[PDB]
Amino acid sequence: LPFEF
Amino acid sequence: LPFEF
Amino acid sequence: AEKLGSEIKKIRVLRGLTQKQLSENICHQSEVSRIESGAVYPSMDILQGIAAKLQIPIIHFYEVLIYSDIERKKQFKDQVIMLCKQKRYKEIYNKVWNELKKEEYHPEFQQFLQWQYYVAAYVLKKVDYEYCILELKKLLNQQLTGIDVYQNLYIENAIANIYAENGYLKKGIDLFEQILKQLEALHDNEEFDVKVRYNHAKALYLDSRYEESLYQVNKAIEISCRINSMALIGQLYYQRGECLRKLEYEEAEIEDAYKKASFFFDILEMHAYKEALVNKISRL
Amino acid sequence: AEKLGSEIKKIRVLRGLTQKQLSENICHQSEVSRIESGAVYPSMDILQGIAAKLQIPIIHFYEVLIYSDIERKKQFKDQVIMLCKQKRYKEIYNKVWNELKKEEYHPEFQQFLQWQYYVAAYVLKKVDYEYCILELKKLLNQQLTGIDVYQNLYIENAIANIYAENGYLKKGIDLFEQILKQLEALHDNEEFDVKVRYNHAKALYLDSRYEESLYQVNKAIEISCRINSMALIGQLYYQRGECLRKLEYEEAEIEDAYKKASFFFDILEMHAYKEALVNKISRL
């Protein structure tokens, strides 16, 4: 999963 | 369970 | 209190005129410092004299004051909401009474305080349910509406809970119905949406309207998931379980809903709610 | 726009002097009607004429206007966060661009707009990662602090992510460390606290710092459960699973974390996130 902005 | 305030 | 002086520091520093030049206006150097720390709120006129030396537009300090007051009040509502969740009513009672004691004029915020005062009185046993409801209705029929459109509905939610838990299930239900109807219209603040649906389902359950109850509970779960909130979800699964058991769905779907409630109870370290649950699964 | 107006209405109604009687000041009758709706904003001096009759302190309408602005801007920030969660960056970009292009002087709101403008540009492929970081660093060394003390940290979370997601893991981590250090000091906005630790945990994982990643993932879970938020909790359990498999924990542990994650993914109908997950558990 990707990072959270 | 109880009611919620 | 302390922001006025803090923004006076920020600005006078960046203006390029000395702190003792701001002294030779209308006050000793000391007063400027005591204002500078927030200690003393400047007098209306002194401030207008300071308003001459850093430039600056007058409405910039009022601007400052208004943000600091809305934040002060927002922070207090937040704090009060926080103890409600923790069931800390002796503290609520004290906190709101002390705030009312200042008797400062702000109708909407005073309504917030009184709502919390009368409910806390109720929980603390200072006041009857009949009396608490009366007092709460005098609030609705101020018929105010400031910045917080939800505040009457919050006050309505309390009125319906007190009725429902004191046996008046049909009155409480009708009321919950009024609220949901006003929410469909407004929006959005879905945590509350979930909370009224949860109480509505309880009252429906105690009136043996099990499908109705279950419908409402599924809907509240659905909303809880869309706003990402675990605030009442474990007890929503508990309630779902109870409904599916009075409607005699497959043991599977029943026990299912219950493990889920159980999961949230442990995850949420909700030891009171956890207790009852382990009771029932053997008992019923 | 329309608050100044509809407050001019509520009062005129509850003072007892007609809007026609509110004509004979310095303005035509129709002007009062447009103003009363909020179709028009009056001019500084002209409004003094409406402040003449109604009663009335001047700071009141301004206060109204200031409360209106603050809610206006909160609403905007809310709507913009919502689009972030939904990942609707073409929409964010257009929205904050349209809002910037009226260049209204409010340094902190302008900074929020710029943060959003630069991240959305980045995601939309309009700018380099290097260029975006450069622009976000300019927002930090404005060294503002207005109403919202967390804004620089949000800006910092963006920088740390772009570095990490582009292979600068050690710079990413250093940064998330800085952010967490400033959090402990501030308190509390624990939804952010959780977001930072999620990302820190991911970056630590890609740098083979698995324990460190795991301690951080558990801490986020702990926080997530204490504030009742499911926002990132599925991703967290997932990450937990990842850390436990690399550290070769007993198989059942590993599967438990992924079971939890799985559950959160149906419930929140996070179909894309569920995709990846369902591959691995048999693939790996």
Distance CA D159, CA C222 (A): 35
CB C219 within 8 A of CB C197: yes
Alpha-carbon distances of B4 from C8, C193, C194, C275, rounded to whole Å: 45, 12, 10, 18
Kindly report the number of other CB atoms within 10 A of residue C29's CB atom.
12
Question: Which residues in A lie closer than 8 A to residue D276 (C-beta atoms)?
Answer: 1
User: Please, are residues D109 and D139 in contact by the beta-carbon 8 Å criterion?
Assistant: no
CA D244 to chain centre: 32
Answer for the pair D125, D138: CB distance below 8 angstroms, yes or no.
no
Chain D adjacent subunits, 3+ CB pairs under 8 A: A, C
How far is residue C126's CA from residue C132's CA, in Å, rounded to a whole number?
10
Six-digit token string for C219: 């809907």
Chains C and A touch, contact meaning at least 3 pairs of CB atoms under 8 angstroms apart: no
Contact check, Cβ <8 Å, C66/D67: yes
Q: Are C225 and D267 in contact (CB under 8 A)?
A: yes
> Within 13 Å of residue C53, how many CA atoms lie on the same side as its CB?
21
β-sheet bridge partners, residue C222: none
d(CA D6, CA C237): 44
Cβ of C99: how many Cβ atoms within 10 Å?
A: 19
Contact C244, C253 (CB under 8 A): yes
Q: Does D93 touch chain A if contact means CB atoms closer than 8 Å?
A: no
Question: What is the C-alpha to C-alpha distance for residues C209 and C243, in angstroms, rounded to an integer?
Answer: 9
How many contacts (CB atoms, under 8 Å) link C and D? 39
What is the biggest distance separating any 2 CA atoms in chain C, rounded to whole angstroms? 85
Domains and CATH numbers, chain D: 1-284 (1.25.40.10)
CA distance D94 to D104: 17
Six token digits for residue C58: 């007058």
Could you say which of D67, D71, D228 has the minimum Cβ distance to residue C230? D228
Pick from D158, D165, D238: CB nearest A2 = D165
CA-to-CA distance for C7 and C55, rounded, in angstroms? 13
CA distance, residue C94 to nearest chain D CA (Å): 24
CA distances (Å), origin C116, targets C95, C283, D29: 10, 38, 44
- With the C-alpha atoms ordered C164, C167, C169, C175, is the resulting torsion angle positive or negative? negative
Buried b (16+ CB within 10 A) or exposed e, C220-245: bbebbbebbbbbbbbbbbbbbbbbbb
CA A1 to chain D, closest CA, distance in angstroms equals 7
Resolution of the model in angstroms: 2.6
Residues 6+ apart with CB under 8 A from D131: none
The amino acid at residue D59 is I
User: Which residue shows structure tokens 């109908």?
Assistant: D269
Q: What's the length of chain C?
A: 284
CB contacts under 8 A, A 1-5 vs D, are: 1-5
Say how far apart CA D161 and CA D200 lie, in whole Å: 9
Residues D268, D272, D273, D275, CA torsion sign? positive
Gap between the Cα atoms of D185 and D52, Å rounded: 49
Residue whose C-alpha is closest to residue C106's, from C146, C140, C78, C158: C146
Q: Which of D267, D108, D232 is nearest to A5 (CA)?
A: D232
Whole-number Å distance between alpha carbons of C143 and C119: 19
Which DSSP letter does residue B2 get?
A: -
Which own/partner pairs from C231-235 qualify as long-range (CB within 8 Å, at least 24 positions apart)? Answer: C231/C191, C231/C194, C231/C195, C231/D228, C232/B4, C232/C194, C232/C195, C232/C198, C233/C264, C234/C260, C234/C261, C234/C262, C234/C263, C234/C264, C234/C265, C234/C267, C234/C268, C234/C270, C234/C273, C235/B1, C235/C198, C235/C261, C235/C264, C235/C273
Nearest CA in chain C to D231: C228
Strand partners, C185: none
Chains in touch with B (3+ beta-carbon pairs under 8 Å) read C
Structure solved via: X-ray
In order, the DSSP letters of chain C are -HHHHHHHHHHHHHHT--TTTTTTTTS-HHHHHHHHTSSSPPPHHHHHHHTTTS---THHHHHHHHHHHHHHHHHHHHHHHHHHHTT-HHHHHHHHHHHHHT----HHHHHHHHHHHHHHHHHHTSS-HHHHHHHHHHHHTT---SS-TTHHHHHHHHHHHHHHHTT-HHHHHHHHHHHHHHHHHS---HHHHHHHHHHHHHHHHHTT-HHHHHHHHHHHHHHHHHTTB-TTHHHHHHHHHHHHHHTT--HHHHHHHHHHHHHHHHHTT-HHHHHHHHHHHHH-
The residue assigned the tokens 């430039």 is: C55
CA C263 to chain centroid: 27
